[PDB]
């Protein structure tokens, strides 16, 4: 049944190398949903962080439309191996390294709805670049992003839009996943830019990372403040008490050195 | 089955010489599928109770494309999980306490997917961290107290103990630090270090106050110095005993 449907679609003259038709010659609108699973290996030296995520794309290809709402055919059919459909040449502008997961079956899912709507889901492991600034160490805040755009097709052919409902979905325990930071807000914005080759539509999900101030407080700031205060009480001691003032002065300084290390 | 590992960050198959897969087709049509896989799974860990902590890591397993209507995963009835002979000792840092096979079937925006979950429970080797850090700091604090029982006039006696004890305390702290992974949140090991560091520091500062008021040579003050020493012999052991009760009852879980 399902295999018979897929066959009927690709028996006709179909070319996955050809952009899907549009009602008014406009661009193909790809609706994008993003699922963030893990954030890990944040590096301030190499200005990068590792993120694993599930990408969900959706567009309309009237060539793949095989049915109406009120027919005996299944609403959507899972695309089997050996059949290629046109897919957005989407990529990640700020990705330095990236892998797909291929253990057993590769982790992709393609659904072809009856009206011709295509759902594309894929698990991706990224290592994105994230320039960080530590002038306010450790009470600083960092913002890392995941840019998403098309490589070959310009604005006349493809246009990216964040999904209307819940564009970004974090995993259950993502905020606690980070040892160093605590993410307060995530945002989905557009980063469409004009380049020398043309105007390319682009999406940008941004995560904001704040560092834990509580540690540094009780590990550095609080003990050092008390240390400076202790150094003062040598002033209230008499001059003749050499063992008292010499000890306090040296002891306090030696302890401070240990703190810095 | 289009099975995969939801919480896998990196994964490889073993292909040396011939690939390491095995497929048996029984007469009734039952298929047996065996494969060697090397995983690198994500396991969020928490070190608030350092090092008296416990970690639980998991191996999620599910289908990617097929919903509950096409495929359903079930753990084998007899011996679902099999550990290798010396697996629990293989880990240098931890000691495996429990293994469990559970279901993690979840409902997502794309559908309801059947899922399995193997879980391992990890306990850290506490005997080293117990005996190599807790014991010497305990002895160090004890040694620092006997300077209260020493006379004010024995400057070489009290000055030595105060400074020597503190220097040894720093060295112990440094040794524990390398082993300890860098983490931004406060750990149990940090609390117990900072406390012992303070108790020894205050014991030395106490001497400075005592040596000061004694030196001013008038008997109201002359004798007060001893009074300071007397209350120190009681205050410090009580405060330290109070701390231990508070500490171990907090990081006893």
């Amino acid at each position, epitope marked *: 049944s399902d295999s018979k449907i897929l066959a009927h679609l690709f028996t006709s003259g179909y070319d996955f190398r050809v952009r899907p038709p549009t009602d008014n010659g406009g661009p193909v609108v790809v609706s994008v949903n993003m699922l963030l699973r893990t954030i890990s290996k944040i590096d301030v030296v190499n200005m990068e962080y590792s993120a694993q995520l599930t990408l969900r794309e959706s567009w309309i290809d009237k060539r793949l439309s095989y049915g109406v709402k009120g027919d005996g055919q299944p609403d959507f059919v899972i695309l089997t191996v050996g059949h290629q459909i046109w897919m957005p040449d989407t990529f990640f502008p700020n990705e330095k390294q990236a892998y797909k997961h291929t253990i057993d079956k590769p982790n992709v899912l393609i659904r072809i709805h009856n009206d011709g709507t295509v759902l594309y889901s894929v698990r991706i492991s990224l290592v994105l670049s994230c320039p960080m600034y530590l002038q306010y160490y450790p009470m600083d805040v960092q913002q890392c992003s995941i840019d998403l755009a098309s490589y070959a097709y310009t604005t006349k052919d493809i246009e990216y839009l964040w999904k209307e409902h819940s564009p970004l979905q974090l995993k*259950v325990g993502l905020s606690s996943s980070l040892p160093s930071f605590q993410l307060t807000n995530t945002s989905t914005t557009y980063c469409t830019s004009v380049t020398n080759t043309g105007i390319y539509s682009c999406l940008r999900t941004t995560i904001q990372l704040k560092r834990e101030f509580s540690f540094y407080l009780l590990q550095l700031y609080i003990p050092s403040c008390m240390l400076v205060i202790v150094s003062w009480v040598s002033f209230w001691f008499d001059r003749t008490a050499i063992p008292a003032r010499v000890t306090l002065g040296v002891t306090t300084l030696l302890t401070m050195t240990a703190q810095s290390a | 089955p289009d099975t995969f590992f939801p919480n896998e960050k990196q994964a490889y198959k073993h292909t040396i010489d011939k690939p390491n897969v095995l497929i048996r087709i029984h007469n009734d049509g039952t298929v047996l599928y065996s494969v060697r896989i090397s995983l690198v799974l994500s396991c969020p860990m928490y070190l608030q109770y350092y090092p008296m902590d416990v970690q639980q890591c998991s191996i999620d397993l599910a289908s990617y494309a097929y919903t509950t209507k096409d495929i359903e995963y079930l753990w084998k009835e007899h011996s679902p999980l099999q550990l290798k002979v010396g697996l629990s000792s293989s880990l240098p840092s931890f000691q495996l306490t429990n293994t469990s096979t559970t279901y993690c*079937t*979840s409902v997502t925006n794309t559908g309801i997917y059947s899922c399995l979950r193997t879980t391992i429970q990890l306990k850290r080797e506490f005997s080293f961290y117990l005996l190599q850090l807790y014991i010497p700091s305990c002895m160090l604090v004890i040694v620092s107290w006997v300077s209260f029982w020493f006379d004010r006039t024995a400057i070489p006696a009290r000055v030595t103990l105060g400074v020597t004890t503190l220097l040894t305390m720093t060295a112990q702290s440094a040794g524990i630090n390398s082993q300890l992974p860098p983490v931004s949140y406060i750990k149990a090991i940090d609390v117990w270090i900072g406390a012992c560091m303070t108790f020894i520091f205050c014991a030395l500062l106490e001497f400075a106050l005592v040596n000061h008021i004694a030196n001013a040579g008038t008997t109201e003050w002359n004798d007060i110095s001893k009074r300071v020493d007397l209350i120190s012999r009681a205050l410090f052991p009580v405060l330290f005993f109070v701390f231990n009760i508070l500490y171990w009852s907090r990081f006893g879980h």
Partner: antibody
Amino acid sequence: EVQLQQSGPELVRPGASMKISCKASGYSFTGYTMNWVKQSHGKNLEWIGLINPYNGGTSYNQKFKGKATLTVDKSSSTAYMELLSLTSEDSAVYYCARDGDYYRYGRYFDYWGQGTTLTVSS
Amino acid sequence: QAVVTQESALTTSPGETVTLTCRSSTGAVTTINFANWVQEKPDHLFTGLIGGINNRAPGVPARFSGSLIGDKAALTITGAQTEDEAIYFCALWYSNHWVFGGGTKLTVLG
């Protein structure tokens, strides 16, 4: 203890559409998925749909494709069910039943609501 | 597409043991049917009892116990009580589906 207080009884005319609420309390709302069961007189208990408060993901019965719509407001810890194109057949008592497992579909009913009586007559 | 069948009604005495069955029309009730048992007190009160793989709802008495006797699901009450007198519904999980049964009207003679 936990509670699942639903909306009060409603009375509407055929063609209209109303929405039943189900306010949760006593637990982490986003951790347990909610079911919806329809109890009519003529027919047995009919399971409608389920919805995950966290994902927002839904799974409906083929019988109620388009008849029911499950939503969720995480802030007020409430699950909603909108019934469209109401007829005399939709006159029944509707329950919301919680799933029993924490942040996973355990496929077993935990707690139920007091029920919401929907009467649709012309 | 599929109908779940229960007994009309059963009668038992307090302290004794009664077993309610739950037959599927498509065949034998396997483990992938995830037999659920729901109790209906009067005045439209409902609470879950035993469900899914081997799960039990919080607060469900130890006298309640599930199994797969024969080729159908079973809900056995060992040591019936006065308050155990109610209507018990069994629900079976068909792939992408749920189906409740007619329900058994259990009577505990008080």
